[PDB]
Ligand binder design. Sequence first.
Ligand SMILES: Nc1ncnc2c1ncn2[C@@H]1O[C@H](COP(=O)(O)OP(=O)(O)OP(O)(O)=S)[C@@H](O)[C@H]1O
Ligand SMILES: Nc1ncnc2c1ncn2[C@@H]1O[C@H](COP(=O)(O)OP(=O)(O)OP(O)(O)=S)[C@@H](O)[C@H]1O
Ligand SMILES: Nc1ncnc2c1ncn2[C@@H]1O[C@H](COP(=O)(O)OP(=O)(O)OP(O)(O)=S)[C@@H](O)[C@H]1O
Ligand SMILES: Nc1ncnc2c1ncn2[C@@H]1O[C@H](COP(=O)(O)OP(=O)(O)OP(O)(O)=S)[C@@H](O)[C@H]1O
Ligand SMILES: Nc1ncnc2c1ncn2[C@@H]1O[C@H](COP(=O)(O)OP(=O)(O)O)[C@@H](O)[C@H]1O
Ligand SMILES: Nc1ncnc2c1ncn2[C@@H]1O[C@H](COP(=O)(O)OP(=O)(O)O)[C@@H](O)[C@H]1O
Lengths: 548, 562, 605
Amino acid sequence: QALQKYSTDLTARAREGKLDPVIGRDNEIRRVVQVLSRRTKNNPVLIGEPGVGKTAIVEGLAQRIVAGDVPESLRDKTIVALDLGSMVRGEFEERLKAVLDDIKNSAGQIITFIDELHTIVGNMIKPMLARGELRLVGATTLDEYRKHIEKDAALERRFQQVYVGEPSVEDTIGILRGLKDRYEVHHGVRITDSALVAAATLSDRYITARFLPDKAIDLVDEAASRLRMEIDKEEVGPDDIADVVSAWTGIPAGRLLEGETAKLLRMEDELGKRVIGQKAAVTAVSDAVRRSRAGVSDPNRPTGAFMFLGPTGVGKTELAKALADFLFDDERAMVRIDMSEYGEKHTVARLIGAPPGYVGYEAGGQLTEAVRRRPYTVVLFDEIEKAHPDVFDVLLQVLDEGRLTDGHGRTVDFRNTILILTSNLGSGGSAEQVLAAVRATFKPEFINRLDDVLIFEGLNPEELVRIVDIQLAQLGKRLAQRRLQLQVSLPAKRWLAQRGFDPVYGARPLRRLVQQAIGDQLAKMLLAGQVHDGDTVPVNVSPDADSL
Amino acid sequence: QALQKYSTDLTARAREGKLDPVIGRDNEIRRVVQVLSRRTKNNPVLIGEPGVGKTAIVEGLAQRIVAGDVPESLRDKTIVALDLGSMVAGSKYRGEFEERLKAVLDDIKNSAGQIITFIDELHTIVGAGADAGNMIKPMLARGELRLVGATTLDEYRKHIEKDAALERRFQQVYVGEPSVEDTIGILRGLKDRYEVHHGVRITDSALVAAATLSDRYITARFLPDKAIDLVDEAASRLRMEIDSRPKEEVGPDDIADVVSAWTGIPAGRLLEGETAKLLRMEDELGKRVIGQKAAVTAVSDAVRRSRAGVSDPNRPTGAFMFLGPTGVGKTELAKALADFLFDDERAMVRIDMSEYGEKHTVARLIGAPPGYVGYEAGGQLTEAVRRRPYTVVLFDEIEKAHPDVFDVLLQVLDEGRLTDGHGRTVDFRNTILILTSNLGSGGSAEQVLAAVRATFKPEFINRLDDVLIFEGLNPEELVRIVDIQLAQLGKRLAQRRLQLQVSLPAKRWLAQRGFDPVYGARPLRRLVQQAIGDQLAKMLLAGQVHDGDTVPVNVSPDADSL
Amino acid sequence: QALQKYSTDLTARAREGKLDPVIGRDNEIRRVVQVLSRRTKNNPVLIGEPGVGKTAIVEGLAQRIVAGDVPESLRDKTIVALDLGSMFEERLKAVLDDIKNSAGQIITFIDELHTIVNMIKPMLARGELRLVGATTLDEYRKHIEKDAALERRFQQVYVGEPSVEDTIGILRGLKDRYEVHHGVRITDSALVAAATLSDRYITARFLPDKAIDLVDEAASRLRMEIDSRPVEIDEVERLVRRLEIEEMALSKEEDEASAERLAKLRSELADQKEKLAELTTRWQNEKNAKEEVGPDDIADVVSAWTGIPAGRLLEGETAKLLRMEDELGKRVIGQKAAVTAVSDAVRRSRAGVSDPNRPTGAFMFLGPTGVGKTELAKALADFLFDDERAMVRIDMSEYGEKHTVARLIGAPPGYVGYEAGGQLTEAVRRRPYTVVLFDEIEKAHPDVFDVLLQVLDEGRLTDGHGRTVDFRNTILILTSNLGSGGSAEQVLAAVRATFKPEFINRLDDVLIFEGLNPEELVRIVDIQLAQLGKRLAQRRLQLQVSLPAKRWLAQRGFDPVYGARPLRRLVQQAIGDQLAKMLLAGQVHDGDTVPVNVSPDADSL
Ligand SMILES: Nc1ncnc2c1ncn2[C@@H]1O[C@H](COP(=O)(O)OP(=O)(O)OP(O)(O)=S)[C@@H](O)[C@H]1O
Ligand SMILES: Nc1ncnc2c1ncn2[C@@H]1O[C@H](COP(=O)(O)OP(=O)(O)OP(O)(O)=S)[C@@H](O)[C@H]1O
Ligand SMILES: Nc1ncnc2c1ncn2[C@@H]1O[C@H](COP(=O)(O)OP(=O)(O)OP(O)(O)=S)[C@@H](O)[C@H]1O
Ligand SMILES: Nc1ncnc2c1ncn2[C@@H]1O[C@H](COP(=O)(O)OP(=O)(O)OP(O)(O)=S)[C@@H](O)[C@H]1O
Ligand SMILES: Nc1ncnc2c1ncn2[C@@H]1O[C@H](COP(=O)(O)OP(=O)(O)O)[C@@H](O)[C@H]1O
Ligand SMILES: Nc1ncnc2c1ncn2[C@@H]1O[C@H](COP(=O)(O)OP(=O)(O)O)[C@@H](O)[C@H]1O
């Protein structure tokens, strides 16, 4: 009572009701009060993620004390918190010893409470502990406890671990609707259970950084305040919260709705916006992804295991680069592993990395280490027909059971990824001998487990226009830093085709071909003159090359 | 006035009786006294692993001094419990801790030789530096302060032995843990304090059960406190159960309740109902395994033997190897067992021995020796059994692993031991090892029993229990296999309200299709999928099938129809 | 009422009407009042960097407060500050008691509380003062990011700098105040040029005050040059005056070796004297027919800042860059494909076309040894900085260990090597314009690649202290010799299987040098002999080599497995050996020229 400047009270202000009723989490209080009444290894410590309700539990304990529900062994005691940030090189221990003296002079069982004790731990308080005068209650997280309370601890023999995992959705919903009338008078508009459950599920779904009991309340109170500030609609609602979540993340409030039909029905041209032609292919792949996400197939299998073959450079990779954007929300999600190194017997274990203590161990495997983190990729396999006939064992093990075991000992799961097996077979075969070749080259019962084996059709010599038009409308962005406009002339743009297609490399050069030509040919004018940001820069076909 | 703000008075604390009654440990106290009464270098240090009672010896000497049961030249010495945390606490300056330590030393030596000191966990005396914890040596090797100490073996080795010139001034008294009998004696001494703290009663049968179970199942801690803790927990637990809820003493089954609540192990004395479950086991397990009557009996008898109290308490709870034809149901029996006695079909630890064709890949389940790349990670198998020490270990198809991995199981079995890279040990004493294979595959019991003897060696075949030979799928009962599959399918189709109406001809044909005697029931799940689930996935996304439809199937001449 | 002395006021200054120009940031003000009208985690803190305009944000907040645009809980709220120009712990009770007795109507604004955080924390846990904060992000993360004891009452509010179209309005709202001291005119041309030019180029400070300091320094520079003789009329005059005194002290030199230094210092004087006259004559033209700020002094102050060149078209730099591919062919021979590529990416930066958030160029060339993959980078660094010493060259062969990543990043605080700073970061933090050479990238530990993966497409990286140095105006070069025997597929596969494809992704064109041939070797023999002459011109012993001699040389050392180094070895062994045999045996003393000629096998001097 003489040095009460680096610590607060919990039972005094509980005579005022300055604390929230603590509905939920009625088991942890029994656990704590049971550990607090032993003879040794008493004075527990709460262990859990930040923002889950550890302080909430200790406050509820204080409130049950002031009410009177505990055994008389614990009856008639106060609780005091400790702020570690109020002290901090040195003199931290001076104030700490001045505090411990007061605690000992308390001459009773006046229980303390220390939040984030792993800032203290040490050998200064253990004699205070192993004598029977203080009782501390703590708080930290699991990995912290494993660090500051496990390596140099030697005190783990007097701290009891109590776990506070995290609430469920249907439980934090009750928590919220219990903590509702408060804000209904603080701001005061109106509250709908629809808004509450919407906040809960949307935070759970898209806010993957924080945790539930406060993560939800954050959005609820911020949205209520935004609605109050609006009055410079007299109700709150689910859209009234999706707008907040969108202003929080960046993704628009439209897509923040149904994710099954509103996705399967988008498998239309929204793919064909980035991919071109091959409409049979896109429709087939869309069937594959739709009927697989229905919810009747075996739950332990990839979400798609189709392959496609034919000519090069027509967009074989581009279909996957676009598909990763629509489903997993990124084009930096695919992983491509060439089956050209894997032409020997031994190198098949390079994509796992076998033993602890050999050359490639901490480097992990090529196929697994890129999956156990971010398990939502889109795996490609260039020129699979060249891989040694031993990789197929690992591959069949994948697509027959959604699991695999790396070198470390971890278990990885492939039950929500998409396999893709490209190939350059089909040199002359149109549709007749190409399938005979791919039925005789690969194992016959392997292809029994695949999905559709669709064959890309060549670029229609007219349907080079759409791809080059996408390329050109893209490069229309290039010189927007100067706002210079571009000229198009269908003879010139078609003159790129017959001299840049090169159907041995698909359509690969048509990016450098045009960017180097236009950019570094204008690089004289763009420095001297001849152009400004209203000039379409008329470029045309000289009888030989592409002058202006 | 220096050793009053940096120390307590342990002998005065013993006078007020605030200490627990040290019981036994007479050789150690006699050695400590005969070391503490020397002429020069009278400094004993109690060394021993954590929890074995190293401070209790010093409190015992304190109580003995108070009672006057010490030799001639040791009466009224008033030992003192020094501490350094309250000295190195406030000082950020040059020469500030040294004046404190020098005042303390001067006050100890200005009094006559009657201030026996006591620094506990003295491995925290090597620091204090920034030439500190080092002023103490000239007074140490001259018999001026006694300095009874107590540290752990590991901490001693790590901190003190790097300073050999100070280890010379210490005599190591080795404190070894007591056996179960001395632990029972200690508990008999200490029962009263707990009986008074918690307003309950404690029974000697419960004490014996604590000291015994605390030694067969908790194989990481040490005895005199590992045993006391069970008593304390059960007493507090019973007190809570008596209160707060509007024959009242701890019994020899509450301790089993605790030691089974944590560690998971079902150690106990067969509470009622569990016995009914165990008796009704051969059939309750048959609901997921059709046939193989000769094999389920062995496993069931093994489990019953283990829990009835008649089984060698230091050897695995079963080491069967069952082998036979292909797709007969071996792995499936294993999974059915694991689901039976754990309620989680993945609560087992299966390793796929088809991957160890190369010699070196053994290190995955051992770990790597000191000084190599993956060292502090440990071994897969060792770490997977060190926690959850009650699982069912499974070795799928141990016939590809070339004959150098066998020689690790050769001592896994028959003792339940295994050592990782760090030199620890795991206890397999209460798992069930199961290892399948495929040798033979169709032949008589003497055309497979010879291939076994030509593949494995006597030292290994001689380790395990019965070598079960699985039968063939009787062409009459496959309707029940199909029924099991359809039960699984219907359970999967319950997020909606769908049901199935499979006709007898449909079921009969489904069994008749895809059960070739060369592959057994292997190509059946895939067939059911491709012939029902695909057809219905095309039929659910395109309307005309909505939740509630008891979808009927039919047996059209060609492949099945809906 | 006892804080009227220890703190200023903004409830009365706003009624009187004096406040700095606040335009924009109205959404920020709305965010601040919105977070103030909450129950928990209210009372925000502003996060940014010095000179973004959060001071202006709170000032506009105060003006809007006195005007009235508020909710009900904001009855003018009499927001005040707590003057950090008022600084002991016995007075702070007297300061805090006034706010404590109030009902939350005198809320404070702790400008730069980053150092304030005992006394304010318990008085915050009861919830009586708002204590509006404003700091920077790194100091925030250091001080009050890890302490969750106080992070339950602080909601960080991010702010950005650029408001270009209103930055010009701010310049206007300040243009009046900068024309008073400097007797100059600050034109809208200058406003809009500085608002538009120093933004991407001078990327060390931030627009809302760097666009201010540019105009301030331009004003001061112009006011200085208004004095009779301006810049570049005060420069060649100070040069020619000094040059003369260097000539009048060399005539009285009884030396023959300094005559050639007297015979040149005279000439450069004769060359600089004219350009003095030409400017002086043209001066009177403008004297009878600069007195105002424009767009040229802007680029002037840009160039004089951070060494970065950023002008309209700098009238001495025009024909150099179109001559680059040819100007570079004086030092590097062959690899037309490589010189075209390395060249087409310097203009696209001096033109303003290239991507503004990526290095001004970053790509790799590799191939056999002794081809020029290092002489090319050296030649590049020689004609941009005019001295080859001005290239940052780090070797990746010493970084073969994992824990050597902290060698070029620095070691964390509290360790031994801490004040020494980094090795790569500490060179690009101060004066970033150089070219950084990564010698033998293959020999490095495949973990430093994860740092260049950051530098690519982000343009910065962090060090041991936590700050971020910028990498947006340099060129990054990679050298290696993977394969070294394969045509094009072995080396392609080797680099593809040695580096991540998402590291080769952000790279520009990947270059493969060919190797030298007989036709390109005579041009190298000439460079070698010219450099050798320039070297032994310190004893005035010029050489005289014949065409059969140069052909004998260029034929002798050619073998297409080691490149060109055998040529230097042969030059030394065949000429310098004999020459140094004679030079200390007399008979070839200073001031001499010895001819060489082909003999049947050797070439006698
Ligand atoms: N059962 C509950 N009853 C009432 N409020 C609860 C409950 N569980 C969580 N909360 C609230 O959730 C928020 C989380 O606050 P805290 O309990 O302090 O978080 P924490 O888990 O203790 O970790 P810290 O201390 O925030 S780092 C507070 O507003 C609590 O009041
Ligand atoms: N011989 C004994 N007689 C009575 N009680 C004992 C005896 N041995 C151990 N105990 C009790 O068992 C526990 C042993 O704890 P301590 O010996 O005090 O700790 P420790 O043995 O020093 O281990 P550390 O390393 O200090 S944590 C205490 O509760 C003792 O009272
Ligand atoms: N008696 C049985 N009761 C139920 N399902 C069975 C039975 N026998 C086989 N099966 C089914 O057969 C399928 C595969 O059987 P498995 O036991 O996995 O084959 P196996 O015993 O592992 O033999 P191999 O050599 O490993 S293929 C599973 O779907 C089981 O459900
Ligand atoms: N095309 C060239 N232009 C200019 N100097 C050249 C050329 N080819 C060779 N040289 C000279 O020959 C030597 C080769 O220098 P480097 O460029 O370091 O060799 P390199 O091509 O880098 O081979 P490595 O892999 O670095 S050993 C230097 O003395 C160069 O001056
Ligand atoms: N249908 C298409 N839609 C869009 N771009 C396409 C299409 N077909 C080919 N392309 C373009 O052709 C080029 C080749 O892409 P890709 O197939 O990934 O090449 P590679 O086979 O060399 O890896 C890319 O620039 C890609 O955008
Ligand atoms: N939007 C604005 N436009 C023009 N001048 C401004 C604007 N906001 C503030 N100012 C003035 O210019 C100064 C720029 O520095 P300031 O914004 O105070 O930085 P800080 O407070 O972060 O140190 C302000 O102090 C103010 O006098």
